[PDB]
Amino acid sequence: NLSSFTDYLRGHAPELLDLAPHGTTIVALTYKGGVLLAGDRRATQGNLIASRDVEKVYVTDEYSAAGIAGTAGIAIELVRLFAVELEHYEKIEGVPLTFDGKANRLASMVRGNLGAAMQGLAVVPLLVGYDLDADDESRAGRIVSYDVVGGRYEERAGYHAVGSGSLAAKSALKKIYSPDSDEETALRAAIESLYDAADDDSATGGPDLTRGIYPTAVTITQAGAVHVSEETTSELARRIVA
Amino acid sequence: NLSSFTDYLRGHAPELLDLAPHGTTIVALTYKGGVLLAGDRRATQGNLIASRDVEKVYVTDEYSAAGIAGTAGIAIELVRLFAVELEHYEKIEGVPLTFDGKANRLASMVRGNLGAAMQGLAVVPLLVGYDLDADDESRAGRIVSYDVVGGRYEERAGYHAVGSGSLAAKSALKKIYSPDSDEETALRAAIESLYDAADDDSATGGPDLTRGIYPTAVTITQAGAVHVSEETTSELARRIVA
Amino acid sequence: NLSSFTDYLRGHAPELLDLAPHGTTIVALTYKGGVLLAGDRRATQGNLIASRDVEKVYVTDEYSAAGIAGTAGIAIELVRLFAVELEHYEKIEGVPLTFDGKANRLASMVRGNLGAAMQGLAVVPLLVGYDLDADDESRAGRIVSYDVVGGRYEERAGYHAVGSGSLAAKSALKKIYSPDSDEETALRAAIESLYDAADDDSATGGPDLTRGIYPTAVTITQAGAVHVSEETTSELARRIVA
Amino acid sequence: NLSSFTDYLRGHAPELLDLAPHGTTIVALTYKGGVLLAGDRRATQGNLIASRDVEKVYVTDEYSAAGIAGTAGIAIELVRLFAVELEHYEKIEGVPLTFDGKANRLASMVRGNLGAAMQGLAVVPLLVGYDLDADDESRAGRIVSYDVVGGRYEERAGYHAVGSGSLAAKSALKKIYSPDSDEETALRAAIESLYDAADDDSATGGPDLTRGIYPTAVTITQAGAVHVSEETTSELARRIVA
Amino acid sequence: NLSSFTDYLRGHAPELLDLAPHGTTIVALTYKGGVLLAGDRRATQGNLIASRDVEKVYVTDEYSAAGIAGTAGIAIELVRLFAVELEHYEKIEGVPLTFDGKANRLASMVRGNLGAAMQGLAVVPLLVGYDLDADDESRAGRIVSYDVVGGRYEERAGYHAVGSGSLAAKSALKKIYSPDSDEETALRAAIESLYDAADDDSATGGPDLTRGIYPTAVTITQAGAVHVSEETTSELARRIVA
Amino acid sequence: NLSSFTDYLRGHAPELLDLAPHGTTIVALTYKGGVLLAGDRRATQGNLIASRDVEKVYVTDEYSAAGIAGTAGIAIELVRLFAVELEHYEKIEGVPLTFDGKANRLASMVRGNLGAAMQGLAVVPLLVGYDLDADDESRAGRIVSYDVVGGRYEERAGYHAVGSGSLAAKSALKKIYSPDSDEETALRAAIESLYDAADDDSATGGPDLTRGIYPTAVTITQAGAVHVSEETTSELARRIVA
Amino acid sequence: NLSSFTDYLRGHAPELLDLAPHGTTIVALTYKGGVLLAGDRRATQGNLIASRDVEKVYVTDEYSAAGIAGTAGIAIELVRLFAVELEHYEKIEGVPLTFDGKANRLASMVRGNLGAAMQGLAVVPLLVGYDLDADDESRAGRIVSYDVVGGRYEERAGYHAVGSGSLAAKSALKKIYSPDSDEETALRAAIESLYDAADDDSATGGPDLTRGIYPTAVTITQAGAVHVSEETTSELARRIVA
Amino acid sequence: NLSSFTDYLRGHAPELLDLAPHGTTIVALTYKGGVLLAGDRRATQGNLIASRDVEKVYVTDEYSAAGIAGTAGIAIELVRLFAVELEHYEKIEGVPLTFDGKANRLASMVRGNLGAAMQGLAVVPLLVGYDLDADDESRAGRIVSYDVVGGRYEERAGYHAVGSGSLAAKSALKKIYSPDSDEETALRAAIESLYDAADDDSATGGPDLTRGIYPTAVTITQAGAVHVSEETTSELARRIVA
């Protein structure tokens, strides 16, 4: 009734707003074309590995996507809803939400979990998208990070990450990353830091050539967001190794 | 229904009223023309730096603005709402609120966070503005400080500050500051105390010439409020150094 | 004065009896010749990897050795002391201790740490050796496991393990292992289970071909104990992979 | 009576074995000649800066030195004592201690503080030295790291660090450091990671060109250990900058 | 709907009924003409001085005023509301409230804060006024003191006080005060005890000649209540001094 | 039996090693001649003033003295003992202790109160002295500060302070102070910051012209230490005022 | 709507149903004519005297009154309300309530406060009255006492009391009191026990000839209740003294 | 064995170093002749008066005496011992202790009770005496106050007091007392403040003309200390009353 699918639940179906299978690291890079997301796939509840093929990065809509780090359970339902929220607002308003809209909405959905957060079950996302409304379609990619209390923040440094090995990955990028670059160079630097995060963090554990476990990725550009192929990544991670 | 945007939510949408990325220092000076705000840009969750380019001062309206210190997440949404509260009161009443009104409002919104305040997540703002209704348009610049329980307070000493390094900056100004002065001299004493604050406080860390991290400022006068330029600041902090 | 180096400390220098860098998995296998130990080399304090080259298995004396799992700091000093407890008893008595002696001593040393155990800083070892006093030099290899309260337990099943990934390894061996076998077959089955333990346990993380991190091993026989080479392990784990 | 200055106090003057002024980061690099230590100089009690000129690295003896991170009060006395323990053992024995001795001693002194550690007042050192007893005088420089429960650990990666910005610095070196290099190159990479540690950690805050606050350093080689000059550091950090 | 501005909020806007900037002492004297209030101006949060110019006494209505000691945030809003409660009741009823009414109201507002009181944020007022309904217009000035649980109490001793230095001041007056006197004499004895309160209480700190910090005062009589001039105070405190 | 008076008690009379009357601020300045101490005289238990004439600075020996902040009771006996420790070491050794000795001693005595410290009853001293063994008798003045855990620290900035208002006084000096200066100029900057300390701190309250309460001072030079006269202070604080 | 003023609040204005100024002793006596109450006038919060002229006995209606002991604030409002509860029932029903009615009502009002009771802020009253419906107008005086949980109890022994010094007074009366007697004899015995209660109880403190502090009294009879004069008490307590 | 009776117990009989009957107020005045002590006599355990004739001030020796406030039990034994301590040191050394000796000794005895103190059972004395060694026998009287942690303090203001009504008494004296005066004027001012203390404190309760309870006093002068007669006080307190 303000075109918020969420807010509809709010008034018509409220029941929809390490004890359980944890998180992992996720990286974000800006570049000439657009932007991209790459994130590990290891879900760990304790020191015990619970799953090694869990997708952490999802495509929210046509020109954006986000990766969520924290309690798998809570993080999944949350992104699915965020997606819905965005789609519904389009089918109703006719148009899609600004990028700054999608973000402020995601924030609200985060600010909403703050209760569970202070109770251990916290989640935090990393939002990326091609700003169809950006003046210079050159730097039209964007990266938004979040709080637990629901703060929205602008990247403004070309990259960022969230999760256990984020401090690691962020540091690797501080070196292995440079502005305006290929959607091949970036997707490379990504698989990289995601390798370094795995080095200094048992909770991540990036590319594992022996098992066939490869980082999940997604690139967004003036054409939209597309999930990178399992081939473009593996023959890409093999390249990174030495 | 009293022209309060807030109060509308109060009754039609109540869901809008170091675990997460902290604060920083913000100064305020009075002068001949009007008044101004200058604040650090370093957000620190823990002892770890979370961002070095965060803006802490915003322009609330044509003839006023404020800076907030405390949980970034909470502080942001809070000022964004304050801005709206004001703009909406204008469009409805046709006229704007007294300065004393804008203040009493901001304080109500602060009192409203008292709950979160007593749970660590506190925030406190610094409000400044050119009082279009002041008898002597000479001393028409004002500074209001706040409690946590939402008390409103008048500067009456030409300067103030809030944040970890406030105690330090206040003391610097207690020396490097003098009444009626240039909108070049005050902006000068502001980048100054903002420097001394960073000296005796790892949570602040004002002007960093090596990184390109400069203090955010904003001045308000009989012409309104305007955000100082990145240039007017850097070539200004270089002057301060020695 | 009972030929116990320890007991000498007991009466003449008593000061020698995840806040800090944790444990890992260690396996023990019995076979035709004798017995062996193989342990991971990853030390993890928290979910963070602290070291990936830490040796967990040590050769206690000519015909025995043991791997200890638990607080690295407490576990190091404990084995070293055990070693000395052994060597000193020989030099003094002229002969060496029975294997059942060496074990009962090691048990005493564990019992001693129970204090620290009940405060998180616990440690548990795995003891193996060629019993020069066993009747049938065919099954002369032995495995002793321990409690926290200082219990001594006999393997009697050809294999055992201790650590975070022990439950895993134990199970892999419950399959990939068979009695009387090569000191090549068992050194094989060890690297194996040491691989499966790493699969279902982020704390362990066995053979990592990409980094050059290989499991440490040791085999004791009628000739005595000797530390397997870095070559006999890598070209051995490569074989294991698929 | 075992040549242990310490042990004499133990039996003849036992009274010598953020409420108060904290720590900072320290780095350690290995190279062709020998090894070195470089560490920040900022002491921080709270978020407040307590001193910006505190030396964190000391030369323990002719061929060795160490940096200690943790409560300054406890860390000072502890190293001064280690110094003496080493010197006294010499004058008595006539010869000096093995390097492996000096470390085992240092570790015992740390294990000694474990009580205070589990009460907040913890301290951890990083030990380096030119092993006069090493076979290949090429890789004769060594790095030992410690636990809180007193574990002794070998570097075996050419670099290491301790302190708040340690995770940072360690990561910077993971990129900017290469084996066998100059005692100019390493001293370079040190001041570097020490800069990066200050980037992502308010508790550190490396080279400050504006204030004249430069990292403290020390190199040890076949000639012994010598404290690098204030000039060799500043005209070195200026170089690092861009 | 009982002419209670308060009670309207009660049913139509309930949201209006040392972490934060504390109190100070306030004195009350009776005399020939009417009565008066004089109170310190130092707000102290901790041992730290937060403001030295805060007015603690306000004129509630034509013939009455009150001073409130306790958490400044809570004490301000509370008196401002009491003000309104009184004024609104008039405009509606046409006539004003008895004095005994104004107090009974004030007490209810205090009883209202009892919740916050039992949580540290307590506030207590001191009420004075010229009972236009008193038989002998000689002793027509009155003093009412309060509880925290909201008790209303009559002075009946010509003077009283509240705040940290209250015990002090009350004692000074027990000596330096005499019944029926000038509105110069009482204003004199007030500035006096207010000086003595500052002698034995760091939280107060009355007249400060050097800084120009003078006690705030207010007298009420058959003409009404009027705030004493900054001159009548300073040239009055100078007199008191020796 | 090591010429330590203390140590004698240690073994022959061990019984000598806001519930109760608190502290205050104390400053220290370096200069051409020597160095000096100036400290407040207001003792405050609670928010209540307990005494306004207490001396916080004492002359430890011919060429040194110190001021202590923290529980008065503890602080007194502590300095009295320090004095004796020194004098007794002289009479026995015939010579006096290095300045660096007197310091190391004072720190041991502080470490000795660590127990009481962690129970609220803490105390911290400021030691100053003319180093009769300093190469350049120009900068022969020294300032040593302390931890609570007994750390010793060198000023190396010409000035320091300890106490509630230290933060304030330090900041004042950070402005009103300059190197090599008169023993009239420094004593001037001392009464100054001692004034600003009292401005932003109710626990201090420096120079009070109205009461006759003046800051206690002491200067040490190549001639020794001498306690400044009540006159040299009053006619000095009158000069400072405006 | 049952003629209960209270019950009207219950459904139309519910907001009307030693941190703060305590109680005192109150006595009740039966006699020929009717009954009476006499109570101390000292309010004590802590060990500190807060007021020495507070009236504890009030006349509820024409033929009854009561004294309340406990939290002054809670006790005041409670009796006032009782009064009104009574008067209103008359105006409405036209006649007055039975005495057994007035009591059962008062009991209900007490039962209501039980909440606050169990939190320290308790209060207990003593109710007396001339039962216009008693058969033998000789013993028409009555005394009712109460619980905290709201129990109603009959005297049936001519006297009773409540307060800190009650145990004392009760005992004095157990001696100095006899049935059917003058309203001069009983007013005498009351001032007496009210004297002994003060002897063995610093909280009470009856008749103080030196200060002019005299016990408050009230006598109800077939004529109704009337408050004894200040003369009939002082010249009455003077008689009691020796 | 240092002439300390106490210290003898220390080594030969250690067992000699509101649940129970409390304290009271005690005053101290200086004057032309010598000095004096006067203190209430009411012992209160709770709000209940336990005794009204308890002597609180004792004559320590020929030229000194002290009053103790706190737990009667602990305060009695303590002063008796202090007396003994003083007498014994005379019989042994031949001479009596300096005044400054007696005081430092008393302090030690207080510092000794600090354990019980932090457990409620605290005591604190007020020491007075004629300093046989004072230069100007005019101001030869002295007043020493104490801490709980055993601090010793000099009066230096002519008067002081300890106990519940000390804040009161101290204030009364701030007015009713002047320097050099009669041993009749002072003993008057004493009985005075001791009257005022009783006014604002149920725990004291000075002169009671009706019961015959009179303040106990003691004067010391160049002739020695003598306990004032019951007559000199009563006919003295009657004089004070109006």
From Swiss-Prot, chains A, B, C, D, E, F, G, H:
Transmembrane segments: none annotated. SUPFAM superfamilies: N-terminal nucleophile aminohydrolases (Ntn hydrolases). It is found in: Cytoplasm. Keywords: Autocatalytic cleavage, Cytoplasm, Hydrolase, Protease, Proteasome, Threonine protease, Zymogen. Pathway: Protein degradation; proteasomal Pup-dependent pathway. InterPro entries: Ntn_hydrolases_N (IPR029055), Proteasome_sua/b (IPR001353), Proteasome_suB-type (IPR023333), PSB_actinobac (IPR022483). One of its GO terms (biological process) is proteasomal protein catabolic process. One of its GO terms (cellular component) is proteasome core complex, beta-subunit complex. The active site is at T24 (nucleophile). It catalyses: Cleavage of peptide bonds with very broad specificity. It is an enzyme of class 3 (hydrolase). One of its GO terms (molecular function) is endopeptidase activity. Its EC number is 3.4.25.1. Gene3D superfamilies: Glutamine Phosphoribosylpyrophosphate, subunit 1, domain 1. PANTHER family: ATP-DEPENDENT PROTEASE SUBUNIT HSLV (PTHR32194:SF0), METALLOPROTEASE TLDD (PTHR32194). NCBIfam families: 20S_bact_beta (TIGR03690). The 20S proteasome core is composed of 14 alpha and 14 beta subunits that assemble into four stacked heptameric rings, resulting in a barrel-shaped structure. The two inner rings, each composed of seven catalytic beta subunits, are sandwiched by two outer rings, each composed of seven alpha subunits. All four combinations of alpha- and beta-subunits (beta2-alpha1, beta2-alpha2, beta1-alpha2 and beta1-alpha1) yield fully assembled and proteolytically active proteasomes. The catalytic chamber with the active sites is on the inside of the barrel. In contrast to M.tuberculosis, the propeptide is required for correct proteasome folding and assembly. The propeptide is positioned strategically at the region where it can act as an assembly-promoting factor by linking its own beta-subunit to two adjacent alpha-subunits at the same time. Component of the proteasome core, a large protease complex with broad specificity involved in protein degradation. The R.erythropolis proteasomes are able to cleave oligopeptides after Tyr, Phe and Leu, very poorly after Arg but not after Glu. Thus, displays chymotrypsin-like activity, low trypsin-like activity but no caspase-like activity. HAMAP family: Proteasome_B_B (MF_02113_B). Belongs to the peptidase T1B family. This is Proteasome subunit beta 1. It comes from Rhodococcus erythropolis (Arthrobacter picolinophilus). The gene is prcB1.
